[PDB]
Assembly symmetry: D2
Homo-oligomer: 476 residues x 4
């Protein structure tokens, strides 16, 4: 149980550890270092040295080659990383393999982006030459959650490194073993010691210490709105900018002229993937009245066949990350049952699934009231809420009727309607007749309102990890 | 003494006023509405309706013409606005006129930028078309300080309007009469009611109510770091992004091979302008040892010739904004004198200048210790701190040695040295053989560290006043 | 009867003028100077002095203000300019007014684009700073045709002026009076003498002398493919780049699910406007078999009700530009008739329309073979060729089955189909459920294949009128 | 002796060949295929199939992976490629190796630019969404000369492939063996058959057939101005755009305050590299009068120390490409000597150098008249023309005084003068206190005047190998 600081695995200052639990059987199988304020201090110091040293001395093209080599390392180590991630997060091996493949894709994409991050030359007064350069913030802080340790890591650190920053990472205490191994791969790729630091530990300890640290120049946060609020307010003490990738209540909007055959599998996977433990999960399906009942029936058909089991069983769902989250999903379903919200359909936990595991079957509820907590708050489970609308105006009103605004899905044949809704919908991403089929590495991702602010993924991410400097030359 | 809400002049909800004081004589000559939370509520309400209605229905090109007409109105009203601004802020008529001209330039520039704010189409999978659109936040909140009411209004509101946002403005209680008149010009120019809303009042009342309001989508702040911290933390409750344009300790770096004849007047005006009450004021001059004593003597002679009087007198410098700021400057100078920091030279207030006025002659101090409070903290007065350096390395160390990082000036003939230093210096702007060519409307402005974060002015500002939406179309 | 050179109206070197004919009655009412090689020499030399002098010294922002003022003068002179254009070209007064308004819009758009034409800073080796500047070619040559003298002038020259070039224009001998007046307006607007030079005359004289002149740095050509070929080959002697805006055979693609009510008036206007004398005129309509006969019937009814008469009569259509072009249209129709191609319907020429005028009623032909001359060659008359297709594949095959690739229209409600075809169609512009909008000033316009190459209109045009200079600084 | 068409090596149509000559000894050692029109026809048809099929179906990201793999293959085969290039061109093995590394760098650079070539979304009218897509031309033609077969193949084909085109290449009959080998490595890299086609042969046979072919959509030419003129006029028949990378007379401007110690080896290498057979070779040095004589003598010593021998000997310079070019350089030297132009110094050809080789010692001539042919015409040999200037004005006048305008070098310590001159110089690239740097892959390259037009290298090149399509959607 050691942190990764200055290119070496180092013991926690206060020498305490945190258990690593396999959510498939709920049993500990490893430990991580319990990071504290002195651990963060050592990490920032190392990151500062690397940025002001070798890594910062590297050209963008040189940073790109390191990132490209790292991408190859991840690709060669897909099965190894997929095993670690699946055992640690609980997701089926098929999804953990996809996450590893996506991780290598992040590094590959940004590897080519490094030397193509351009500034500008601006028209100005006579005898003047104005140019702008996009420089790294310096030391970037990264808070990575448990639902996608590798994907969000490659998303955040991959862009920050490409921008020329040195990084300090505080991954989630419920899943972070994959991140540690990736750090080893980065060292093998030729990444200078200190350019990437990992401090494991609790959010209120290691995470809070990072957000309060004056040695950080920029913070990339992914997690709950409550914690995002705290991190922002903590970082404000040092006037440090924070990107917020928070939760969401993303709607699927289905009209009567939609191809329900091609829409059905996507609607299911959008809420079943990673057990619904995804910020951009399609947790709401809004159906035009004409096809409300027919689509619910198809959704009911699919959900009834879904099965939940151990990660290694590679079924539709694995277990949830822990008991606390399992109880949270239970509370949503229990409340809904009390309020007379009909459960249209639900999956099943396999009989041989470990009792000590935290398993929850996918659930499809219908006739959900728009104002009801189930349709307003993020469940972070495989629970889909279905309700009807009468026209485009109500579709828009319902879709934007929650405090969240992350992603939205539009399913209709009419092209004019497609682009028209996409403009009215409040979301960082709008998908038309799909829902993030590809990895979405190239697609800038982020929310509005209580889904946070800022954009990561895509080329756009590099702008958030750099700060513009304007140079004005008077030469006559 | 009224607010400007929904295109009409409205009495404050609680019917109380705040005295408007001419700092040239320290006497009240007008009153403003003491804005409170209900006033902010109505302002945001009006902005939201305007954004969802007429103003939001307007195309980019249509918004541009509105700003262009406003630009012409301001240009025609330069003398009128300059008289109001100078009387309220205390700055000389020459500077007050320049501010109004800059205000017109902001609106002129952004008028042409409105329909040229482009999104992107991104390479993606086969059968896919990916496009991005840069949409306004919606309702933008604007905190405007007293030192440059018109100029900062122009860069903030001008960019926000061009981006398609509806604006709620809380200008400074110490000076905001010019902004109120600008709002009328906007109405004349054809800006729909509600698109621009002005709520006067105290920062801890009206200003706080803005920062707390959940109906605002983005905040543009310009002021003290302490206040900027609070505003950020207040807005974090609603996950509202805040741009921070804070203070600075901007250095002038002079080498032995520099053109002292050309540098000398710029070194002076950079700290004399607006009585040194400027975020990016050149409050530090770093001189190479070889020319340290000669340049100090020339700076001393120049400072002795500076005259301070009433704003109508239109001299080198006017009074400070109030007694609280005057006392703050006194405390800096008294502490420096007690610690044995020699005052090389100072200007003199003219005899007939009102005793009740808040006059402070520009002061030149030498041999200032880098770690001393005079060289570390922002004075916001006409005080220049002078010290020497041996080489480029120490110049960089001294320049980046404060918590601030907003603007830096480089004076040297060596071309290689110019660019080499510009890369090393920590600042949003670096000026080579000049210092703010004026008005720097096209030049993106912003700080690092305790100088804040984010960028305003120039085309780049539009990216801060919009949010990227990605649309992924699966069409085959 | 004089050229516009160096800010003054100067007599030609041959003094033998060219008649200006009103196509409404075929009678001359004015004269233009017959420019030859010596007239071109003085114009290029004048523009060279302007680019090296006052005009080249102006900032990008200063150039914008000139263009904005010119926009205002055109707007103030819409009636006068439209009167001239209508009398000279023959187009109905309503279309002449639109041309003038579009001219003012071009100047307005590029007035705001001037100081926003950014270059880049490129990531490079350590100790280096690489910046790119987009500098004007110098002296640009402009060949402007007779069908849209004002709009194409504003398109071509308005962009070249914003880019910072000085212009030498050779407008069409069949219609150029309006351009001469605009040149006066430009002078009144504050455009330096020599920045804009107009040399009237025959294409094989003044036009040929312009394309051959070594003093020109860039040629903007709009006209026939045969002449564009010759101009390119002539300019090849001086290695001068030429943008070729040539004709087309732009198809309108209508599917069975399209809105025929919304499509029908656009289908008609797209070929009737300016008497079909438009490069991007919708000269083909491709209809799905299911709605082939019903649409042709409605098109036939629409065409039978069309009225042609003198320009001042302001009917659906005016006369053609001259006898040669009238005969050209006659040849096409006569050729089609003899090949058994049916004429579904035709318009009406008013009985009191002057016999000496060049009138041609709009003609609708059906069942046109795809390989036939009528469906392959540009008519430049109000002639629409109708045919059917069975599926998207044939629709694409037919649409891309001519040497031309300029504009294409897609009429259908199927969203996926809209985007599918748009990517497959070989054209510079693809319109979905409209045709040409909407002015199209902001829309980059150009062709592929025999429709020419390069792009004008929109912001993109500035790249065609500038050349990239890369400055690589080694500073260590 | 075969072409590379449709992924396999096929025999010539007429089965005739061309001798491959080693310029070191002027002896034949291999043969290339004598390509004619039918060979070109099969090459274009193959490229069309690849573009309409597999290669065109590849996503931008997929194209990049092939390019990166090819980049790795070139790096793996540097020694083999360097040996082939040196023996075929005559350049020293050291330079041929650098050419190989440059080739790998081109593929690496464009591999990452592939999925990052963005289009735009443009602000337009209400109810509209406008997007722009940058599409490949389709089939691109590439004329590659003999001086830098690998490097020019890299910048031209690498960009075209990254842009999504299929390529038909006609390399120089004097040196094209390395290009053939690279084609194999492309196939090994996974590049689909037909995506890259190589047709060897004489320019008046294979080259002319390529330039005239209507199946080509875009021509990338690098060679003599005379041939560049023909190609343009040949392709003008099909309205095919041609990028002209032609020769130059690039000056080095040295002032009295310049670092002569750092400048001296660069001044020499810039003209000595590849025996002066470089379009952007520094064939002129302009020296301020104060340091004219000291620098001439300085350059004289350096030139006198130069050694010329066989390529394998790996000295300062190899032989010229053939007898024709050798005679050309001899004619230049004869005229200069006959006109009394003094030769300050010259290199040394080893006395035992192969008599049947085409060797030429580098020559430094002084007091060269600006109007003399040696100072106006491109020699394409290791000849440097030295002259003096009084001030910056004369320096600019002399630098821009030739019909060429490709690259320019500025040597001075004064920063203002650096940027001031950089704006005044007519060139595609301006280097400050360096010249060409290293590789210059990221630096957009191109000329003005008789240096041609269009830009290649850098990210900018992608715009030259794509065409802009605009899609205007009316959706309400
Ligand atoms: Ca775990
Ligand atoms: Ca006041
Ligand atoms: Ca006429
Ligand atoms: Ca016939
Ligand atoms: Ca050879
Ligand atoms: Mg928010
Ligand atoms: Mg900060
Ligand atoms: Mg063709």
């Amino acid at each position: 149980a050691k942190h990764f600081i200055a290119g070496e695995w180092t013991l926690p200052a206060q020498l305490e550890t945190i258990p690593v639990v396999d959510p498939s059987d709920g049993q500990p199988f490893a430990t991580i270092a319990r990071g504290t304020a002195p651990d963060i201090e050592r990490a920032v110091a190392a990151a500062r040295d690397a940025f002001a040293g070798p890594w910062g001395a590297a050209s963008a093209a040189e940073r790109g080659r390191v990132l490209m080599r790292l991408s190859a390392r991840v690709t060669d180590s897909i099965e190894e990383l997929a095993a670690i991630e699946a055992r640690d997060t609980g997701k089926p091996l098929k999804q953990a393999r996809a996450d590893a493949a996506a991780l290598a894709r992040y590094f590959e994409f940004y590897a080519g982006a490094a030397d193509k991050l351009h500034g500008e030359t601006l028209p100005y007064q006579a005898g003047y030459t104005v140019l702008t350069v996009r420089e790294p913030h310096g030391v970037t802080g990264h808070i990575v959650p448990w639902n996608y340790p590798m994907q969000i890591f490659g998303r955040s650190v991959g862009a920050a490194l490409a921008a020329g920053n040195a990084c300090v990472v505080k991954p989630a205490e419920d899943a972070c073993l994959s991140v540690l191994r990736v750090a080893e791969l980065a060292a093998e790729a030729g990444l200078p010691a200190g350019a990437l630091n990992i401090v494991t530990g609790y959010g209120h300890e290691a995470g809070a210490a990072l957000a309060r640290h004056p040695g950080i120049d920029h913070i990339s946060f992914t997690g709950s709105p409550a914690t995002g609020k705290l991190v922002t307010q903590m970082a404000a003490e040092n006037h440090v900018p924070v990107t917020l990738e928070l939760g969401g209540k993303s709607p699927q909007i289905v009209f009567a002229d939609a191809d329900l055959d091609a829409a059905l599998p996507v609607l299911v996977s959008a809420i079943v993937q990673n057990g619904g433990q995804t910020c951009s999960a399609g947790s709401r399906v809004l159906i035009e009245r004409a096809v409300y009942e027919p689509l619910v029936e198809r959704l009911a058909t699919a959900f009834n066949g879904l099965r939940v089991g151990p990660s290694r069983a590679d079924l539709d769902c694995g277990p949830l990350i822990n008991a606390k989250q399992q109880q949270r999903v239970w509370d949503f379903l229990s409340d809904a049952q009390h309020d007379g919200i009909p459960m249209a359909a639900h999956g099943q936990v396999v009989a041989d699934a470990p009792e000590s595991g935290f398993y929850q079957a996918p659930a499809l509820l219908r006739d959900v009231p728009p104002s009801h907590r189930l349709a307003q708050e993020e469940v972070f489970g495989p629970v889909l809420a279905a309700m009807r609308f009468v026209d485009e105006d109500e579709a828009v009103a319902l879709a934007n009727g929650t405090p969240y605004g992350l992603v939205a899905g539009i399913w209709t044949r009419d092209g004019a309607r497609q682009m028209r809704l996409a403009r009215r919908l409040r979301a960082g991403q709008v998908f038309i007749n799909n829902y993030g089929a590809g990895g979405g590495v190239e697609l800038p991702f982020g929310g509005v309102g209580h889904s946070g602010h800022g954009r990561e993924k895509g080329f756009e991410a590099l702008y958030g990890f750099t700060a513009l400097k304007t140079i004005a030359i008077r030469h006559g």
